[PDB]
Amino acid sequence: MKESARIAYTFARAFLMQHAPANDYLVTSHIHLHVPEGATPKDGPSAGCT
């Protein structure tokens, strides 16, 4: 899940640069996140697109 999350953060920064260049949060802003638990780890990246 952390690999999915770091991949998510990276693609989020890149996509925001592609779509809203003026926006500057993700490039230079710390962000707490929380994913509710319950899902089995093998399916756990299923939420990554979310």
Binding site: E3, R6, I7, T10
Partner: protein, 50 residues
């Protein structure tokens, strides 16, 4: 055979077979361009011990 995959013979428990072993990047290199942290490998495919 796109680069990063290679074919290989294997003696499966019933008969021979032709594997195509896969090898590809799992996460972008750029933790930081200056980063010295090693790229530890992470095998998959139900590794045993040997």
């Amino acid at each position: 055979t796109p680069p990063g995959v290679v074919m290989g013979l294997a003696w499966t428990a019933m008969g021979g077979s032709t594997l195509f072993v896969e090898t590809s990047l799992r996460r972008p290199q750029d933790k930081d361009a200056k980063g010295d942290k090693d790229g530890s490998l992470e095998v998959t495919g139900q590794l045993g011990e040997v």
